[PDB]
Amino acid sequence: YLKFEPSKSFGVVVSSNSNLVWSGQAIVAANEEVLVWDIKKGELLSRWRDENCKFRVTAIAQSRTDPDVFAVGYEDGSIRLWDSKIATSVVSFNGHKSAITVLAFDKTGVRLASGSKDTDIIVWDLVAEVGQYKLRGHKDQVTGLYFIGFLLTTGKDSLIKLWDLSSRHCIETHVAQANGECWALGVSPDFTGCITAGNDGEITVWALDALSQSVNFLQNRGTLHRSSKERAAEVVFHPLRDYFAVHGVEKSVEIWRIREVSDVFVQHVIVRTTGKVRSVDWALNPGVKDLQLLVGGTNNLLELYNIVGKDYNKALAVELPGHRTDIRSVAISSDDKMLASAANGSLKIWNIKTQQCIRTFDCGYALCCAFLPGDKVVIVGTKEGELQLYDVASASLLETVNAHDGHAVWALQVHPDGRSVVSGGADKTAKFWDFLVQSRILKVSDDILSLRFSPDARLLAVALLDSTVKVFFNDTLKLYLNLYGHKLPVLSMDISYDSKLIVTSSADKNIRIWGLDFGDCHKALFGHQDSILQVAFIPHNSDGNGHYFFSASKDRTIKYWDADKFEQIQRIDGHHGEIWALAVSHSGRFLVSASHDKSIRVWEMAGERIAEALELGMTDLNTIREWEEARQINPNIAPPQRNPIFVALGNIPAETYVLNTLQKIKPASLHDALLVLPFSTIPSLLTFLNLFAQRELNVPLTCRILFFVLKTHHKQIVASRTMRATLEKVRANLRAALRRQKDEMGFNIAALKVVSMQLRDKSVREYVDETWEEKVRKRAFASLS
């Protein structure tokens, strides 16, 4: 039951997320890991590969004033601070919910902003390693972040937002686009201006200055428009000269210069790139008078252009350590030391121990690929119905035949003896080519999807568009038998080395285990959330495991199964774009995995409560009056040093505290807790009520609890003495407060009587006639009895 482990992972340069970085080194993001290459020589300097986290990362940031320490923001919402001196995440922050979108570093690098798709923005002390706080604006997700302290940010609702840092809330807002969406944010590093790129290609330009009155810092000094009316992706300034670059995801970037606003800024150049650029990045090099623009193109490429200052030239490039459009097929060698790699547009073969590409060919499309025994030569069936033949040694194309007209040849199977190949197309014919020439063709009902030989070259089986399978004899092409039951067309097949079993994978999210003697389905099995792409046995039962097999499925999953017990023995995660192809070692020692991830991987008490609150408020009043005596003696610095719980509650006054913590409880319980209070607690409560009346609030409550205290202890109060002055205070305060209230509302009802009668007099009658009977509320009052 040897479980398998990802041993290698490669074939790739920058994924389709943003945030390229330059240092003469290029810092790009793989799927999970973050790797650095040299641009002069295409050798990667290193990788930053975290064994703990498997989420993709999409946010990459360099600390200003300190390189070699770098922040990354993942798909889950985590933050990792690494070094380049040593490939170690020094810290991780897990504060958001999903997909850290924008990062930000301090001018001094002690502070870090994290903006996410989950729309909340969390700042981070970088020496206390704490979520400092959490600015909450932004009805939808952030599309930009910058530090000034102060913060400027833009969110996808086309909303630009200026927060303070010391006083945690925003002070300025504007909209970029009334109906559109601000997508990108560009800041003058000298804090003079800001530009907002919105989805029409509209670049609104803004001037910036560096509270009871009208604060105004930003001004829309105008708007501009680029040529591309696409969603602009990113706008990057020159750190030194007066230039910047606008782009969306396109094969073009518009570099404009700095000298009305359209006069201020004109397009310097527009660089056409070979591919849709994902992310742009700046580079300046020591000793050049040029501009090193480092673009990372969505089709898995790196490009370096030189811009002259007072035309572009494709100066440097990185394409060879990975394919470019989408990997489709794989054929690992019989000695299992190299492998052919078949992508749309390209074919690259690679040595596995170097995990490094050795040869490269251009195709148009690559449906399927397979070397020929001896591994001298390789074969690709391609979308146009056609068939192309290359060799690995001279690195050339040998032959090419039109297998089908334009009927994409879906399946390719070398003969087990290795003197013929068979080819199955988007036509109704499966052809047979002995090497070559065409030995024999096969006419069927529908278009063939997949097929395979028998390891003992004795049978074959085909898997058709009709959700079915036709097992035929190898020698003569007679119907052995047929398979059904799959509701959707069977996508792949695989049979046992002893030709005793078949797994059949279809797009109906399940596989079938067939017994190959009369073809009884030994077990139908739903085991994948999506369309299972491919299935593969191990050839060798020399380990004693030959009826174990593997399933690659559209939910980014590989699953390891045993047919004999019909059980899941392992589950294989690790890719994040949908897997397309995979292959097993001839010895079965490992396996390679090709995905739309564009990677290949190799796998080996109540009153008591108010009593204490009263006590706390007494202490509060004591330190407050003492602080008053201090500040009255001298206006020197004097902190009141209230309780941590008061300052945790936001410096609220003690009276507010006690009234709130009393008003929380229900009335009956109030009656009883007020009852249960003891007499030492009484006069402090009296002083609180005195404060309440003097700063009157919830006056019926105050009177009520007052009278309760007095009646339940009417004797002990007239026993004591120190009550007397306090009771006089509460008498004066309460009597004046009640008088104030009553007099005001009595004024109110008086004036209301006046205006009501006057209104009636306005609304008496106008005409005078014989019918005076035109001269009243009513209510319903259902009663059941």
Binding site: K139, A408, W410, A426, D447, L449, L465, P489, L491, A507
Partner: protein, 49 residues
């Protein structure tokens, strides 16, 4: 039943506008209302590709 247009009444009977409302209170009042409520053939190219 006598509420204003952009605003809704509270259970306390206090006027709040949905615009002056916060998102958090919005979520919580949705939760309270729901709480009361609960108390009551294709191409092979597309297929393989």
């Amino acid at each position: 039943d006598t509420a204003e247009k952009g605003e809704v009444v509270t259970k306390a009977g206090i006027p709040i506008a949905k615009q002056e409302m916060s998102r958090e209170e919005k979520l919580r009042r949705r939760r309270r209302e729901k709480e009361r409520i609960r108390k009551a053939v294709q191409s092979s190219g597309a297929y393989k590709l």
